[PDB]
DNA sequence: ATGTATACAT
DNA sequence: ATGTATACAT
């Protein structure tokens, strides 16, 4: 983005996501302007856009604060993504999907199968993460509803709430590596349930799929607390 | 009390009535002149209305009034039901404080007094005011700020609100007679939460959102052009 | 049409 | 510390 407003959005987003501007920190207009070497006006533009994005909260009485996320908020965000993905999957099973959209999502699932070797640790991380992003974008749009697609993507927009969040390409942790086989079995079950018009199953399996991220998070809290801050998308967690 | 704040209220009203139709570009100078204020509180208002979901930011700059069709009304009601079902399920699974259960149960008891001896005999205004309280209490019941925030966001579009197709907005026989069933569901939601029955709490709270969808479907079928005259539906493009 | 800096107000 | 109007820039 070639504008001061636009640059400030990019610069502040990066500082917030990395934990450099921590959750709970008040972002004063004059202080933020001086930090970025611009005036208060492009700063207000940037603060408004970052509030719309959900990285900042507006304070009663004026001003902006970096929205604070503790482990309970991450757990709730992952729960919400799961519920929304479960809705996208159920509505595709209930309302029906076009022949081409089913073929495309089924093709992604078959390609995801090739990321797995003969050993339980033998997984192509980068290949998996790129295809996993595609699968979840396809799932969000599958029932053809613009509103559902929009709400599913919004529920997946916080870095820790993304279907890409706790994957071994972000952080090469044994637990994240070994969680991929199970997650892939769920991708297959989601597509088969949608083809079979099994809305209750499609919802339940897509919702359970989001529990991979929560299980991986719980493993880290218990097994390597300080490593959390070193995992991308988790540096901003206040706890 | 601010120009920014007043402009949010004034523009929201103009959007909800269809005065500023879906697809209309809201220029900074044009909107400033319309509200008799400068561009600065206008940009503040346009940002807040984008967060609310009544406007979209355009890729090359500017704001446009978000277009809503009938498919959007059905989808928004579906999403509110799913979110309310989640708030209900998490309260049942995690548990609720003694005071929060007492407060929501008090609202339900107050809602019982809106009903008479005849099936049509219902206090519409009393019901709608208490219904808003119940749904705000349900959203906050499990004590999670994130859930509360997301449930409220899913209930913010006029046609997606738990108040949307009630007889105080539009006195239609079907809307009147749907209230007894909806009240039995409020009682079932609270009892399922007290009993830690998360699957029941979710199912009952989700079904409770189907009252609005059933009432909408009734109007489309039985009185199609009367829909516009229903508040919160005047902005629907279809 | 919007971006940007700033004076002036509470 | 920010709400607000406005001149001037892009
Ligand atoms: Cl939409
Ligand atoms: Cl200051
Ligand atoms: Zn996945
Ligand atoms: Zn209700």
UniProtKB/TrEMBL annotation, chain A:
GO molecular function: DNA binding; DNA-binding transcription factor activity; metal ion binding
Signal peptide stretch: none
CDD domains according to UniProt: WHTH_GntR (cd07377)
Protein name: Transcriptional regulator, GntR family
Entries under PANTHER family matching the protein: TRANSCRIPTIONAL REGULATOR, GNTR FAMILY, TRANSCRIPTIONAL REGULATORY PROTEIN
Gene3D superfamilies documented for this protein: GntR ligand-binding domain-like, Winged helix-like DNA-binding domain superfamily/Winged helix DNA-binding domain
Domain HTH gntR-type, first and last residues per copy: 2-69
Species of the source: Agrobacterium fabrum (strain C58 / ATCC 33970)
Transmembrane segments: none
Binding positions (Zn(2+)): 132, 136, 187, 209
């Amino acid at each position: 983005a070639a504008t001061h407003g636009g640059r400030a959005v990019i610069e502040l987003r990066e500082k917030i996501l990395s934990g450099e501007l921590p959750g709970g920190m008040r972002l004063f207009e004059v202080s933020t302007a001086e930090l970025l070497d611009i005036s208060r006006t492009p700063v207000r533009e940037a603060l408004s856009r970052l509030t719309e994005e959900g990285l900042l909260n507006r304070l009663p009485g004026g001003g902006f604060v970096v929205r604070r996320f503790g482990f309970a908020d991450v757990v709730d965000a992952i729960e919400v993504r799961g519920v929304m993905e479960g809705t996208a999957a159920r509505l595709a099973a209930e309302r029906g999907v076009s022949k081409v959209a089913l073929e495309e999502i089924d093709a992604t699932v078959q390609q995801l199968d090739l990321c797995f070797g003969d050993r339980v640790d033998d997984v192509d991380f980068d290949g998996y993460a790129a295809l996993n992003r595609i699968f979840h974008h396809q799932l969000a749009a599958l029932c053809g509803s613009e509103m559902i697609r929009r709400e599913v993507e919004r529920a997946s927009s916080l870095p820790f709430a993304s279907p890409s969040a706790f994957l071994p390409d972000k952080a090469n942790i044994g637990a994240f590596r070994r969680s991929l086989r199970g997650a892939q079995e769920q991708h297959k079950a989601i597509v088969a349930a949608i083809v079979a018009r099994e809305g209750a199953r499609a919802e339940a399996v897509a919702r359970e799929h989001s529990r991979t991220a929560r299980t991986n998070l719980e493993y880290m809290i218990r097994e390597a607390p300080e490593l959390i801050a070193q995992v991308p998308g988790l540096a901003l967690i206040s706890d």
